[PDB]
DNA sequence: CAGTGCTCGCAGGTCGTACCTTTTT
DNA sequence: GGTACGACCTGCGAGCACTGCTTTT
């Protein structure tokens, strides 16, 4: 043990990793060693001040940094597994899974997925006066999710500034959110946002529970605090409130989540909320060559009313930062394609390189261009593996197995394994659930009996589901799924129309393969199948080698690569058609995004643009990004083969 | 040298049974020993004249007479096994199964039922000028079957006397028969009447075949010759023509089949057709008590223009013949029910008794009144066991398995084990067979390929694939287990199992079909029997196989009864409108006289007691109607004794 | 370009109609 | 009375037309 702070950390990084008690703010620029300090402190609390691992909580946004830090502390300090380290939402689960029965969340409270929460909205919209038969359900969800991100009730939504939200009348939307709650609450179901707001509701209402939890978080670490919303803050303040051992780390230049409700004021107001906090500032960049740093510092400079802090380079100015405008986007794909294999020959490993884009659609062209040259590719945050119809419906059987209520799942799974269950019979069964205010699954069992709703076809279904329930009380997750896949008939469907479907059944076996890992894994000892549906539904962009890493500019936050390709630096993408109509605040949100990208590169940064670009079936002229003007003369533009132009 | 004639037969019976070569007619009244002569000649040909059994043929109308003459043979004479004994239609089968190719019947031609005849008709009658729904199919079937009973061709039908037939224009009906032939023919298929006409057609065109068959029929016997139709006669004359050893037996008073197309002239004109024949006449009734005979003799007496022949009773006048008019038809069922039990305790066994009725609907009432009292009931000629959907649909798989072109069977099967097979796709499949002149089966295999009958393209390939599996299982497999295969693999058991509460008694019948298919191949005459051989045997069955699928009262029609006898016989529904029937009355005297022969046959079945009944009211299919005594009881009045529900005169 | 919705045409089940009653291979 | 056949809904599937690319636990 005995990790001298001064050995692996510079003097102020050391003094901050030495902070023991009280509120602390660690505020510094990109690649200044913020996270690394956060990892060394965790080791320094245990080894020096003798804090027990079980007293420590460290929370970030994406689960990629969460695992990073777990192991990261380990080869210094054992007990990475004794530490509580995850996202706010993962914590939200664990807390509400242990304490849910206090607030009216019973056994079988579900995790209603994003796509899942649409069928709910569609089913409320008919009842509501605010209309467009044209208003997209996902617009209503935008309102709701963001509202719980601000920690507002439907009543607080009646009183919001704007008389119209998105496309809607203030009171209409509020009412949707008011009938959304009643429906989902009556299904014993909670959504993403609830995992935060409901926890905040748990600590305010039952103070004795908070007290017991704060024993597990005595010493509280938060990375990426610049991206925390009002809810997350409120949860944080409540967890700190007893011992006030809260130490948050962040950068304001890096706050890219505003669209989802990120509050830049949370990191910038930290000492107004905690006057007694200590403030540590890091001025040095350890990550990048001075060549890509000067480029970053000159870009972010253009942002106005930002805290101006020193970021001084510690590395010699490296290989010049380059940009290439290729006539086509396909030639942009081939430029990156080509220049990956070149850099490879020179000795760069595939994994040390990564491709960053504004929006996901940009990845399709990139892939095939890699595929062509046969460059191993690893895409992060594409169309999910758990998004695919194959896997999704199986879990809908899995959810409905544990939760007789879910009618959002019943919709997807009643149809595909064709039981010939009627369309008009689905409406009367919804009129059965409408008249009885009832758990829908039992009405189908009672279809032959009672009010008699094609009669028996329902009794045979409740029997197939009871068979899943009895197989849900006892049987193993890996083989319980198989039971479902088989006995539902989904596997007989897929076999019967199987030529394209055979690759679909291949996915379905892989679900058993991933469920083997989950079960035979170390943290899952005696893990329930309900615990698996939990862990699947919260996954960020390991469950979701030596390959080029494709992904979005947003996802990248917190990582670093020796070589980084930023593609689609163009007016309309970087700063986006949305962010252009926003006005200065919009452009300045983007400028931070482009900043985060630039600060990812360690040795080389290669950025590209296209003269023409296609989006869904029309080719359009493309203009260089306004941001390249901001950095002009800090980079050398390049021809498809690599020389200045 | 064994079977001494003068011991078991009276002298003229003996002289007749002694006839060896040349045409011979034995013509006598009821219960005279005509059939009883027929063995003793057959036995006398073998033991005395040294005729070889394989040279002998004996023919009748009903398998019941095929049983009679087989038992009569075996239980009375050694070496009875090779004797060729069956009906005309059964003969037609065996002859056409052996020689068919000479006349253009391919290997494995299919034998259609009478029900079967209607998918063919319903297919053709849309194209012909005489329009349907006014004219239902079963009328057109009536013409064709009767046309071929006369041995006539569509052209001959254009030349019939009547300008209208049943409800139809002469040439319209003729045209339907002309397009029914071309259809049936193109399926490699033939109906019953063909089993005669085609055989007659086979002997006329190819002489060398007739010659080879006439070796097996050198000596020919025909019982019940009075009921033979024009075709049957023509088939007989041809089989006789070479050696002319034909001996026919019969009674004119007994000719009840005119509606069938029976020729009363055939037995009457025998010596005009065979001027060298011998004519033996039996004047004695061995069967019945003098009391049941006098009643018969005095009834038939009323018929006019019939040959007058003395039937003199040999048995003392027995228990008086009784008649009872019960208020209801139910009380008539109850009177029969009641009096059966009575006759039982006094020592009569159930089987010695039988109940005869005119039309089959009369049996339902009777049954339950037997069931009530719990009297064992053996019903002959009711709704067939092989008529039932369960059975019939399985054999439609069997037929179609052997014969790809059977679109009459395909209809009754393709949809039953629901395959998603198109209603509207059946019309496209029929427009495929209409456009291609093809058998239907290969259009289903060619579904995914070719013209692609879609919205279910795969559905048809999976069908023809289920049928090839039935073809290969038809290739080499046991009849018993081959049907099981069909029952399972078609999914017909699956349907009845799934909705199985009522369908369990149905899947029980399907067990019985495997049971009789098991009982059949175990049978002695079936050695190395093909399943094609079974379907042949099944579709020709008269009113053993039908009755099986003991010691019981026998229920059956007056018609079927022809040729049998019982010590006790009930005759029910002797009433104006049943005996002689509402049709027979409208026919006028010829009709009246037919029915009088029909009633005559009933009376002459009874050995010891005949008991006849009537109802004052009779329900048929809803409304209860006033019922009247039959005008025939008038004919026999003072001859019998009326009775009350308990047995004494009113 | 693609994923989703939404409407046409076709399978099968259930429910109300007409005719039945001659008789058999 | 019984059956056998012809007209009425529900049910599912495969070519339209359509419509959306921000960014995420
Ligand atoms: N005292 C040090 N000596 C050498 N390297 C260091 C030191 N401190 C930090 N680093 C390195 O600096 C790099 C980035 O550190 P990091 O913790 O990721 O900063 P960060 O602020 O969390 N990055 P970001 O979240 O994007 O702003 C890592 O490669 C560290 O190894
Ligand atoms: N010579 C006889 N000796 C003893 N019994 C006889 C003699 N002749 C006839 N019988 C019996 O009387 C029955 C009637 O004769 P049978 O020929 O069988 O009926 P049938 O003459 O054909 N009447 P039917 O069948 O209505 O035309 C026979 O079956 C014998 O039982
Ligand atoms: Mg960091
Ligand atoms: Mg006889």
Q: Which of B610, B603, B620, B602 is nearest to B560 (CA)?
A: B602
Q: Is A158 in the same domain as A244?
A: no
A633 is in an annotated binding site: no
The values of phi and psi at residue B168, to 5°, are -115, 155
Q: Is A177 in the same domain as A213?
A: no
3-state secondary structure B53-107: HHHEEEEECCHHHHHHHHHHHHCCCCCCCCCEEEEHHHHHHHHHHHHHHHCCCCC
CATH code assigned at A507 = 1.10.486.10
Residue A254 bears catalytic tag: yes
Catalytic residue among A34, A70, A148, A230: A34
Q: Is A294 in the same domain as A173?
A: no
Q: Is A197 in the same domain as A257?
A: yes
Q: Is A507 in the same domain as A593?
A: no
How far is B486 from A518, CA to CA, in rounded Å?
48
Q: Which of B257, B232, B145, B247 is nearest to B563 (CA)?
A: B257
Residue B378 bears catalytic tag: no
Q: Is A411 in the same domain as A439?
A: yes
Work out the burial of residue A642: count CB atoms within 10 Å of its CB; fewer than 13 is exposed, 13-18 middle, 19 or more buried: middle
Q: How many domains does chain B have?
A: 4
Q: Are A1 and A77 in contact (CB under 8 A)?
A: yes
Method: X-ray
A224 CB neighbour count, 10 Å cutoff: 26
Q: Is A212 in the same domain as A77?
A: yes
Find residue B164's DSSP bridge partners: B169
Q: Is A378 in the same domain as A291?
A: yes
Q: Are A550 and A355 in contact (CB under 8 A)?
A: yes
Residue A600 bears catalytic tag: yes
Q: Which of A472, A511, A474 is nearest to A490 (CA)?
A: A511
Of chain B residues 455-514, which have a beta carbon within 7 Å of strand C? 455-456
Query: From the CA of B421, how many Å to the C1' of D8?
Result: 20
* Ligand number with the minimum distance to the CA of A287: 1
Domain end among A282, A314, A338: A282
Contacting residues for A377 by C-beta, under 8 A, at least 6 apart: A367, A370, A371, A547, A548, A550
Provide the sign of the torsion angle of the four alpha carbons A111, A113, A114, A118, taken in this order. Answer: negative
A35 is in an annotated binding site: yes
Q: Is B494 in the same domain as B531?
A: yes
For residues B96, B99, B101 and B104, what is the CA-based torsion angle, rounded to 10 degrees? -50
Answer whether any strand C atom is within 7 A of the Cβ of A616.
yes
Catalytic residue among B198, B223, B234, B332: B223
How far is B211 from B391, CA to CA, in rounded Å?
40
Q: Are A199 and A175 in contact (CB under 8 A)?
A: no
Domain end among A264, A282, A300: A282
Query: From the CA of B136, how many Å to the C1' of C17?
Result: 15
How far is A165 from A557, CA to CA, in rounded Å?
30
Query: From the CA of B73, how many Å to the C1' of D15?
Result: 74
Of chain B residues 167-206, which have a beta carbon within 7 Å of strand C? 192-193
The CA angle B636-B637-B638, to the nearest 5 degrees, is: 120
The CA angle A551-A553-A558, to the nearest 5 degrees, is: 95
Contacting residues for A60 by C-beta, under 8 A, at least 6 apart: A66, A69, A85, A87, A222, A223, A224, A558
Domain end among B166, B192, B218: B192
Helices A194-205 and A230-240 pack at an angle, to 10 degrees, of: 40
Query: From the CA of B424, how many Å to the C1' of C8?
Result: 15
Q: Is A508 in the same domain as A441?
A: yes
Query: From the CA of B497, how many Å to the C1' of D13?
Result: 28
CATH code assigned at A320 = 3.40.50.300
3-state secondary structure A260-309: HCCCHHHHHCHHHHCCCCEEEEECEEEEEEHHHHHHHHHHHCCCCCCCCC
Q: Please, what's the b/e burial string for B281-300 (b: 16 or more CB within 10 A of its CB; e: otherwise)?
A: ebebbebbbbbbbbbbbebb
Counting Cα atoms < 13 Å in the Cβ hemisphere of A110 gives 26
Determine the number of helices (DSSP H) and then strands (DSSP E) in chain A. Answer: 29, 24
CA distances (Å), origin A422, targets A281, A579, B141: 65, 46, 44
How far is B90 from B83, CA to CA, in rounded Å?
14
Using the CA of B623, which nucleotide's C1' is the nearest one? D1
Q: Are B326 and B616 in contact (CB under 8 A)?
A: yes
Contacting residues for A31 by C-beta, under 8 A, at least 6 apart: A285, A286, A287, A288, A560, A599
Q: Which of A539, A421, A546, A619 is nearest to A89 (CA)?
A: A539
How far is A356 from A322, CA to CA, in rounded Å?
15
Contacting residues for A456 by C-beta, under 8 A, at least 6 apart: A448
Q: Please, what's the b/e burial string for B130-166 (b: 16 or more CB within 10 A of its CB; e: otherwise)?
A: beeeebebeebbebbbbbbbbbbbbeebeebeeeebe
How far is B293 from B321, CA to CA, in rounded Å?
10
DSSP-derived secondary structure letter, B262: B
For residue A168, what is the enclosing H or E element?
strand A168-169
The values of phi and psi at residue B287, to 5°, are -75, -45
Phi-psi region of B182 (alpha: psi -120 to 50; beta: other; left: phi over 0): alpha
* Resolution value in angstroms: 4.0
How far is B386 from B543, CA to CA, in rounded Å?
12
Of chain B residues 352-411, which have a beta carbon within 7 Å of strand C? 358-361, 381
* Ligand number with the minimum distance to the CA of B603: 2
Using the CA of A122, which nucleotide's C1' is the nearest one? C5
- Structural domain of residue A348, as residue ranges? 283-384+545-645
How far, in Å, from the CA of A7 to the mean position of ligand 1? 15
A612-615 and A618-621: which strand pairing?
antiparallel
Phi-psi region of B133 (alpha: psi -120 to 50; beta: other; left: phi over 0): left
DSSP-derived secondary structure letter, B18: T
Contacting residues for A294 by C-beta, under 8 A, at least 6 apart: A313, A317, A634
CA distances (Å), origin B269, targets A68, B23, B38, B303, B591: 116, 13, 21, 19, 21
Alpha carbon B200 to its chain centroid, in Å, reads 20
3-state secondary structure B281-350: CCCEEEEEEHHHHHHHHHHHCCCCCCCCCCCEEEECCCCCCEEEEECCCHHHHHHHHHHHHHHHHCCCCH
* Ligand number with the minimum distance to the CA of A32: 1
How far is A337 from A322, CA to CA, in rounded Å?
16
Longest CA–CA separation in chain A, Å: 81
Number of the ligand 2 atom closest to the C-alpha atom of B10 = 1
Residues constituting chain B:
650
Counting Cα atoms < 13 Å in the Cβ hemisphere of B120 gives 27
List the single protein residue with the shortest CA to C1' distance from C24.
B260
Q: Which of B422, B310, B326 is nearest to B365 (CA)?
A: B326
Residue B223 bears catalytic tag: yes
How far is A441 from A411, CA to CA, in rounded Å?
12
Q: Are B300 and B595 in contact (CB under 8 A)?
A: no
How far is A552 from A559, CA to CA, in rounded Å?
12
How far is A54 from A52, CA to CA, in rounded Å?
5
Contacting residues for A474 by C-beta, under 8 A, at least 6 apart: none
The SS3 assignment for A31 reads: coil
How far is A14 from A4, CA to CA, in rounded Å?
9
Q: Are A199 and A95 in contact (CB under 8 A)?
A: yes
How far, in Å, from the CA of B31 to the mean position of ligand 4? 8
Q: Which of A339, A284, A346, A344 is nearest to A309 (CA)?
A: A284
How far is B497 from A50, CA to CA, in rounded Å?
73
How far is B410 from A233, CA to CA, in rounded Å?
75
Q: Are A448 and A458 in contact (CB under 8 A)?
A: yes
Phi-psi region of A176 (alpha: psi -120 to 50; beta: other; left: phi over 0): alpha
Answer whether any strand C atom is within 7 A of the Cβ of B644.
no
Helices B117-124 and B137-149 pack at an angle, to 10 degrees, of: 110
Q: Are B303 and B597 in contact (CB under 8 A)?
A: yes
Q: Are B62 and B543 in contact (CB under 8 A)?
A: yes
Residue by residue, DSSP assigns A502-522 as: HHHHHHHHHHHHHHHHHHSSS
How far, in Å, from the CA of B35 to the mean position of ligand 4? 4
Residues constituting chain A:
645
A625 is in an annotated binding site: no
Q: Are A539 and A344 in contact (CB under 8 A)?
A: no
Residue by residue, DSSP assigns A566-580 as: EE--EEETEEEHHHH
How far is A200 from B358, CA to CA, in rounded Å?
93
How far, in Å, from the CA of B223 to the mean position of ligand 4? 6
Provide the sign of the torsion angle of the four alpha carbons B429, B430, B432, B433, taken in this order. Answer: positive
Find residue A220's DSSP bridge partners: A57
Q: Which of B104, B13, B627, B18 is nearest to B362 (CA)?
A: B627
Q: Is A161 in the same domain as A68?
A: no
CA distances (Å), origin B63, targets B86, B87, B453: 7, 7, 47
Q: Are A561 and A606 in contact (CB under 8 A)?
A: no
How far is A600 from A565, CA to CA, in rounded Å?
10
Ligand 1 probe mutation, A29, A31, A603, most atoms within 8 A of CB: A31
How far is A252 from A281, CA to CA, in rounded Å?
13
How far is B382 from B179, CA to CA, in rounded Å?
33
The CA angle A465-A466-A467, to the nearest 5 degrees, is: 85
Q: Are A70 and A39 in contact (CB under 8 A)?
A: no
Edge-first strand order for the sheet with B553-557 is B377-379, B553-557, B353-357, B566-572, B606-615, B322-326, B641-643
CATH code assigned at B180 = 1.10.10.160
Ligand 1 probe mutation, A37, A286, A292, A602, most atoms within 8 A of CB: A286
The SS3 assignment for A428 reads: helix
DSSP-derived secondary structure letter, B355: E
Find residue A25's DSSP bridge partners: A248, A279
Q: Is A203 in the same domain as A277?
A: yes
Using the CA of B142, which nucleotide's C1' is the nearest one? C24
B56-60 and B84-87: which strand pairing?
parallel
DSSP-derived secondary structure letter, B258: G
Q: Strand C: which bases are under 7 Å from protein Cβ? A: 1-2, 4, 9-13, 19-25
Where is chain B discontinuous (C–N over 2.5 Å), named by the preceding residue?
A: 543, 549
Ligand 1 probe mutation, A5, A34, A35, A36, most atoms within 8 A of CB: A36
The SS3 assignment for A56 reads: strand
How far, in Å, from the CA of A27 to the mean position of ligand 3? 11
The SS3 assignment for A326 reads: strand
């Amino acid at each position: 043990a005995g990790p001298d702070l001064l050995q692996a950390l510079n003097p102020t990084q050391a003094q901050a990793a030495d902070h023991f008690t009280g509120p602390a703010l660690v505020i510094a620029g990109a690649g200044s060693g913020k996270t690394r300090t956060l990892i060394y402190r965790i080791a320094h609390l245990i080894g020096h001040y003798g804090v027990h691992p079980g007293e420590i909580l460290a929370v970030t946004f994406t689960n990629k940094a969460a695992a990073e830090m777990r192991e990261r502390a380990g080869h210094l300090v054992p007990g990475a597994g004794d530490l509580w380290m995850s996202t706010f939402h993962s914590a939200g689960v664990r807390i509400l899974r242990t304490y849910g029965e206090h607030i009216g969340l019973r056994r079988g409270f579900v995790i209603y997925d994003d796509d899942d929460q649409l069928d709910i909205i569609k089913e409320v919209m008919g009842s509501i006066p605010g209309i467009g038969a044209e208003t997209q359900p996902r617009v209503i969800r935008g309102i709701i999710d963001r509202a719980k991100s601000n920690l507002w009730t439907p009543d607080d939504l009646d009183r919001s500034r704007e008389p119209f939200i998105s496309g809607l009348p203030r009171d209409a939307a509020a009412e949707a959110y008011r009938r959304y709650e009643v429906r989902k609450k009556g299904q014993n179901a909670i959504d993403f946002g609830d995992l935060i707001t409901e926890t905040v509701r748990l600590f305010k209402e039952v103070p004795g529970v908070l007290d017991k939890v704060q024993n597990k978080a005595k010493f509280i670490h938060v990375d990426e605090y610049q991206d925390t919303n009002r809810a997350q803050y409120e949860l944080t303040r409540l967890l700190a409130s007893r011992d006030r051992n809260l130490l948050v780390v962040g950068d304001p230049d890096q706050s890219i989540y505003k669209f989802r409700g990120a509050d830049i004021q949370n990191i910038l107001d930290f000492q107004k909320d905690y006057p007694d906090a200590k403030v540590y500032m890091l001025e040095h960049n350890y990550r990048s060559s001075a060549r890509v740093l000067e480029a970053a510092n000159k870009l972010i400079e253009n942002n106005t009313e930002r805290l101006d802090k020193t970021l001084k380079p510690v590395k010699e100015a490296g290989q010049p930062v380059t940009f290439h405008r290729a006539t086509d986007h396909r030639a942009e794909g081939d430029y990156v394609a080509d220049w990956l294999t070149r850099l490879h020959g020179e000795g760069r490993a595939w994994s040390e390189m990564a491709i960053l884009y504004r929006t996901n659609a940009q990845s399709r062209v990139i892939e095939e261009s890699l595929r062509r040259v046969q460059i191993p590719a690893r895409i992060v945050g594409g169309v999910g593996f758990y998004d695919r119809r194959e896997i999704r419906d199986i879990l809908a059987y899995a959810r409905l197995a544990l939760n007789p209520a879910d009618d959002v799942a019943l919709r997807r799974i009643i149809g595909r394994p064709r039981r010939g269950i009627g369309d008009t019979a689905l409406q009367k069964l919804m009129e059965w659930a409408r008249t009885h205010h009832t758990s829908v699954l039992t009405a189908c069992a009672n279809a032959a009996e009672q009010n008699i709703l094609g009669a028996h076809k329902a009794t045979e279904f409740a029997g197939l589901m009871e068979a899943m329930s009895e197989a849900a009380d006892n049987y193993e997750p890996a083989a319980f799924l198989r039971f479902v896949m088989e006995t539902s008939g989904y596997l007989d469907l897929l076999r019967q129309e199987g030529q394209e479907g055979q690759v679909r059944l291949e996915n379905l076996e892989e679900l058993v393969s991933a469920a083997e890992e989950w079960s035979q894994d170390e943290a899952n000892v005696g893990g329930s199948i309900a615990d698996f549906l939990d862990d699947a539904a919260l996954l960020s962009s390991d469950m979701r080698e030596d390959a080029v890493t494709l992904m979005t500019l947003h996802n990248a936050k917190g990582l670093e690569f020796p070589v980084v390709f930023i593609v689609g630096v163009e007016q309309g993408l970087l700063p986006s058609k949305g962010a252009i109509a926003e006005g200065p605040s919009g452009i300045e949100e983007e400028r931070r995004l482009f900043y985060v990208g630039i600060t990812r590169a360690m040795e080389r940064l290669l950025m590209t643009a296209a003269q023409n670009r296609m989006q869904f079936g029309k080719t359009n002229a493309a203009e260089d990004s306004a941001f390249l003007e901001d950095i002009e003369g800090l980079f050398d533009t390049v021809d498809p083969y690599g020389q200045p132009i």
